[PDB]
Amino acid sequence: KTFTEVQTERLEQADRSVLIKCPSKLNEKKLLQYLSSHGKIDNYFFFENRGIHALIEFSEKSSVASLQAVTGIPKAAEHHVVPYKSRLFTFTLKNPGSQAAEERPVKISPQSHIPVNELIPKLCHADSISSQMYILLNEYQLTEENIKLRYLACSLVRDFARAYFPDSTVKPFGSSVNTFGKLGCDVDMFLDFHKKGPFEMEYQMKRLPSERLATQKILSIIGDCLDNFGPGYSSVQKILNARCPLVKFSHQPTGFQCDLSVSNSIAIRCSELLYIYGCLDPRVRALVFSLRCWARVHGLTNSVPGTWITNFSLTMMIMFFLQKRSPPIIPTLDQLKELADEKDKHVIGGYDCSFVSDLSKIKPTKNTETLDELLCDFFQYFGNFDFRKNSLNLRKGKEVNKPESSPLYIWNPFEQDLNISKNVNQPQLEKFVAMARESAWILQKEDKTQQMINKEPWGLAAVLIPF
Amino acid sequence: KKTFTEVQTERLEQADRSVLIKCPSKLNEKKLLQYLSSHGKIDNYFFFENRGIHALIEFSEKSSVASLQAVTGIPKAAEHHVVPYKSRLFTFTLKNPGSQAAEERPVKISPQSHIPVNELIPKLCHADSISSQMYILLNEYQLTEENIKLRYLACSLVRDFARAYFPDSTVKPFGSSVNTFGKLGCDVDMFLDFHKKGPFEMEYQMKRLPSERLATQKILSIIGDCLDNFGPGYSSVQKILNARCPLVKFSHQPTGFQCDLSVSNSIAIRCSELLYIYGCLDPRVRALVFSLRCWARVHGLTNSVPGTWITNFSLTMMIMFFLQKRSPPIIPTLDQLKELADEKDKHVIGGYDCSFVSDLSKIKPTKNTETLDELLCDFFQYFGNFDFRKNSLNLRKGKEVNKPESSPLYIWNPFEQDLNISKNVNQPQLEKFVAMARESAWILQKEDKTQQMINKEPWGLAAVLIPF
Numbered sequence: 001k002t003f004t005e006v007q008t009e010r011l012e013q014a015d016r017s018v019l020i021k022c023p024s025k026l027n028e029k030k031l032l033q034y035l036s037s038h039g040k041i042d043n044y045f046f047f048e049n050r051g052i053h054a055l056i057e058f059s060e061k062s063s064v065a066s067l068q069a070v071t072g073i074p075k076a077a078e079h080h081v082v083p084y085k086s087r088l089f090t091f092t093l094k095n096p097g098s099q100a101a102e103e104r105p106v107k108i109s110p111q112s113h114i115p116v117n118e119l120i121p122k123l124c125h126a127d128s129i130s131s132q133m134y135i136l137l138n139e140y141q142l143t144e145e146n147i148k149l150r151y152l153a154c155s156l157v158r159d160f161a162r163a164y165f166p167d168s169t170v171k172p173f174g175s176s177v178n179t180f181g182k183l184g185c186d187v188d189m190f191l192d193f194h195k196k197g198p199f200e201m202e203y204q205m206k207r208l209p210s211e212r213l214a215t216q217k218i219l220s221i222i223g224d225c226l227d228n229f230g231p232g233y234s235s236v237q238k239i240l241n242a243r244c245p246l247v248k249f250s251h252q253p254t255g256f257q258c259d260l261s262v263s264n265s266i267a268i269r270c271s272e273l274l275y276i277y278g279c280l281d282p283r284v285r286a287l288v289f290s291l292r293c294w295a296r297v298h299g300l301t302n303s304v305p306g307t308w309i310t311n312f313s314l315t316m317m318i319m320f321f322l323q324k325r326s327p328p329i330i331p332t333l334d335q336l337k338e339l340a341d342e343k344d345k346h347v348i349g350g351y352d353c354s355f356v357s358d359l360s361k362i363k364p365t366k367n368t369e370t371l372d373e374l375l376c377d378f379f380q381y382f383g384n385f386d387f388r389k390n391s392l393n394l395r396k397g398k399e400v401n402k403p404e405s406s407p408l409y410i411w412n413p414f415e416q417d418l419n420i421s422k423n424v425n426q427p428q429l430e431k432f433v434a435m436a437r438e439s440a441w442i443l444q445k446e447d448k449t450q451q452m453i454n455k456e457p458w459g460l461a462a463v464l465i466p467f
Numbered sequence: 468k469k470t471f472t473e474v475q476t477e478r479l480e481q482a483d484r485s486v487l488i489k490c491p492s493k494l495n496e497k498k499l500l501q502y503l504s505s506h507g508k509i510d511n512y513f514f515f516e517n518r519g520i521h522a523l524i525e526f527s528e529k530s531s532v533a534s535l536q537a538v539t540g541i542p543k544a545a546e547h548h549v550v551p552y553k554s555r556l557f558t559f560t561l562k563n564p565g566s567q568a569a570e571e572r573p574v575k576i577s578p579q580s581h582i583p584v585n586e587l588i589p590k591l592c593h594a595d596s597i598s599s600q601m602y603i604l605l606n607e608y609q610l611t612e613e614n615i616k617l618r619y620l621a622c623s624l625v626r627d628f629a630r631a632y633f634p635d636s637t638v639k640p641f642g643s644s645v646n647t648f649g650k651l652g653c654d655v656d657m658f659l660d661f662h663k664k665g666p667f668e669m670e671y672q673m674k675r676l677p678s679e680r681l682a683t684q685k686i687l688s689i690i691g692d693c694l695d696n697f698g699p700g701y702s703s704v705q706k707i708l709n710a711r712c713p714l715v716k717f718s719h720q721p722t723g724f725q726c727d728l729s730v731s732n733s734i735a736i737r738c739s740e741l742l743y744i745y746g747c748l749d750p751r752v753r754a755l756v757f758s759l760r761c762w763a764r765v766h767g768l769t770n771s772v773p774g775t776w777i778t779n780f781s782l783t784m785m786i787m788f789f790l791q792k793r794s795p796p797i798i799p800t801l802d803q804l805k806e807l808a809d810e811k812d813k814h815v816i817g818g819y820d821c822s823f824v825s826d827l828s829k830i831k832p833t834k835n836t837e838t839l840d841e842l843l844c845d846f847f848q849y850f851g852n853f854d855f856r857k858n859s860l861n862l863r864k865g866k867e868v869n870k871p872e873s874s875p876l877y878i879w880n881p882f883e884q885d886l887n888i889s890k891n892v893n894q895p896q897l898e899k900f901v902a903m904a905r906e907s908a909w910i911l912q913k914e915d916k917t918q919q920m921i922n923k924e925p926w927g928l929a930a931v932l933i934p935f
């Protein structure tokens with residue numbers, strides 16, 4: 001069960017899935033009975049998105065074509081649609097006024113988490129801090145249904161990209177696949193491209209200077225195509241001049257906000273690294289989900305980029321913390337490099353990104369610290385950390401001198417000599433520290449039993465309300 | 468024979484299953500065709516010069532293209548410094564250049580441009596009569612079979628981009644490229660065209676378009692950008708989306724053509740078929756057009772760039788009007804062709820009637836036996852004495868009529884009948900046309916042909932194809 005195996009399997013399942021906008025009067029049994037005539041159905045679910053929608057995952061890829069064969073084109077008076085045929089369908093009843101199976105009803109798989117004000121009560125009603133964090137983790141994490149929906153979005157963009165580039169693939173990365181994803185987070189997608197006789201035979205293709213110019217031209221054209229031809233695509237925004245060129249859009253059927261970029265093979269290795277750490281111990285994920293929520297409540301993070309610390313930066317700080325335990329909760333990257341082999345030996349653009357993929361090759365942690373300790377110690381550790389003189393190196397798992405002058409310096413573990421938190425200024429760092437120290441204080445000085453009895457917030461709940 | 472539409476469909480189908488291969492410097496024809504034959508049967512092929520030897524290959528089967536593509540790789544210059552759009556443009560090089568092991572036979576190069584005027588004049592002087600001069604010109608200038616395949620292929624390559632999101636699209640050529648009056652070196656005018664199970668009514672989700680002009684502009688804009696950036700070989704891509712008929716101009720380096728891509732001129736296609744019929748009816752028709760069009764170019768009456776000049780197309784219609792006014796007429800009128808049409812040939816587009824026969828046998832041949840010697844001189848005489856102030860040219864009736872609007876030269880658009888196809892022409896350019904017509908008539912009347920032949924001087928067509 002390696003990261004890459006899972007990706008391939010998830011993509012193959014997304015390959016043979018479809019989305020159906022369901023009728024207002026919905027008969028589950030009749031719908032599945034009909035669709036079963038096109039082939040076996042491995043899995044399905046329903047979700048709410050300006051009407052009831054259904055994801056259908058067939059056992060066979062041929063069932064998609066079968067269904068497409070009996071699907072027609074919409075036909076209006078103005079009658080002007082872009083006739084791109086996808087795997088987005090709309091089912092309506094032939095005779096709507098002759099059907100009265102109104103009270104089914106249908107199980108709706110949620111795609112967003114409960115808001116904080118609903119979550120706080122549940123945390124107060126828990127037994128310990130450790131449980132508060134796991135409750136949060138469970139309300140927030142990606143469900144199996146949401147994950148299928150994400151890979152499908154990639155798959156739909158793949159087919160759309162395959163109009164001009166038939167050998168293309170679109171693989172997700174970042175929070176969507178590194179185990180640290182929460183409901184409502186964006187889908188980060190990257191576009192990838194993959195002898196008898198006397199002649200070497202090649203295509204004629206325009207020779208541009210660098211990857212960068214091609215990348216920009218491709219994304220620009222795909223962008224325009226999504227905007228003008230793509231069904232359910234919207235708010236298309238081209239950001240082709242960033243360090244990593246990128247196109248943003250919202251996909252109405254799945255409801256996701258999406259980021260399409262090209263060939264970032266580094267970010268994939270990073271996604272696998274965080275995948276490993278997330279799989280090694282359940283405390284890792286529990287801790288990240290809570291601290292990331294904490295940062296949002298106190299305005300340390302923000303939706304728009306700027307001087308704020310990013311979830312990703314924060315996540316790496318949390319990993320560094322976990323590397324510095326006695327004994328360490330997770331191994332260092334260098335430790336993972338020494339356990340790698342030739343199969344796991346990836347070198348990309350000069351940098352070494354090699355590390356083990358097999359989980360059993362990693363010796364489990366002897367550490368038995370509870371989350372009560374780890375949460376408070378996180379605030380204590382970074383509330384007393386010397387950010388002027390020290391930087392966070394996740395390869396060595398040690399504090400080291402800063403290569404460059406920067407308020408918060410965190411070492412990019414692959415593209416070394418980059419600071420993943422270069423964007424952070426001193427005002428935002430000082431606010432992080434102040435909130436850390438205040439949160440530590442609250443957790444230390446709180447009389448938990450007294451707060452429970454008084455029907456007041458305590459533990460995680462106390463640090464997840466504004467000060 | 469066959470009908471205009473049948474030919475188009477057949478030509479496009481053949482272009483559908485053709486490819487262009489940039490050949491090695493050391494070219495072994497036999498070995499190349501032997502290898503390509505392993506991917507399927509080859510109906511036709513030829514070679515042409517264009518910054519190196521290129522080859523058009525027309526397979527019998529469309530599957531042979533995919534077969535060939537399957538064994539074709541990516542160049543890999545810098546490890547993704549190319550745009551990986553895969554087309555039907557290939558580059559063949561030798562695996563081991565040091566293993567050539569056969570005798571070097573040279574290769575037949577099919578020309579794609581005609582000889583220049585200064586080379587043509589001698590050939591015309593050495594001919595027997597004026598009639599022959601015109602047929603010699605016609606033969607040096609007309610489209611070859613190879614050039615025609617190359618034109619339809621260019622359309623086919625442009626089609627492939629458009630079908631990415633409009634799968635039922637066609638890019639069909641029109642104008643001189645297909646109306647029999649095309650000459651080597653003329654541009655390619657292209658237009659883009661778009662044409663009970665269960666208890667559930669099942670439909671695709673598909674993005675709505677805006678109304679025709681805005682869609683057209685968005686589509687051409689995107690195809691334009693694709694030609695420019697996904698390539699290969701497109702160049703000088705120029706978007707002119709705000710014209711009365713939105714349009715994208717470009718030059719295609721592999722085929723060597725200058726191209727005009729627009730959307731849905733179904734009228735201009737009917738016009739192209741009309742001229743096709745006239746061109747097929749009698750060989751004198753084409754002979755006359757090719758000579759007069761050449762005449763106009765030599766005397767600066769026409770020009771490459773649009774403006775106040777008479778256009779080849781306008782001139783061509785004037786020539787058709789002339790031929791309608793013969794005794795007996797050399798070609799039938801459009802109304803005559805409308806009366807011979809049936810339901811199959813009954814085309815009505817945007818309010819206007821564009822119906823006319825497609826079958827050639829339904830048209831009775833012409834009794835007219837006038838030679839080209841007469842027709843050429845009579846053309847100059849007729850229009851040199853024509854009253855352009857009081858008369859307009861109506862090709863439907865085949866008659867001179869009053870001008871609906873005030874315009875120096877008024878020629879009736881035979882389909883969109885509110886319109887003057889030569890509205891662009893001012894009085895200075897019309898007066899120059901008339902002056903050149905009258906002077907050309909005079910030269911042909913007063914020339915002593917035998918005296919000019921003996922003196923090694925220009926005569927007949929050659930005399931009117933040198934500047935005054």
Ligand SMILES: Nc1ncnc2c1ncn2[C@@H]1O[C@H](COP(=O)(O)OP(=O)(O)OP(O)(O)=S)[C@@H](O)[C@H]1O
Nearest residue numbers: 173174175176185186188267270271311312420421
């Ligand atoms: N400053 C950065 N330095 C190195 N890698 C980065 C940086 N920013 C983003 N990435 C990579 O791009 C991926 C996706 O970017 P983001 O969507 O912004 O972050 P995320 O990890 O998906 O968490 P979310 O979306 O805020 S829940 C990250 O996981 C990184 O692997």
Ligand SMILES: Nc1ncnc2c1ncn2[C@@H]1O[C@H](COP(=O)(O)OP(=O)(O)OP(O)(O)=S)[C@@H](O)[C@H]1O
Nearest residue numbers: 641642643644653654656735738739779780888889
């Ligand atoms: N003013 C016009 N009115 C009507 N149809 C026109 C007009 N101009 C061009 N067309 C159509 O467009 C076609 C091609 O346009 P042009 O390229 O300008 O003419 P052409 O017939 O191709 O002659 P060439 O290309 O100069 S050798 C013509 O056959 C006409 O069918």
Ligand SMILES: [Mg+2]
Nearest residue numbers: 174175186188
């Ligand atoms: Mg993300």
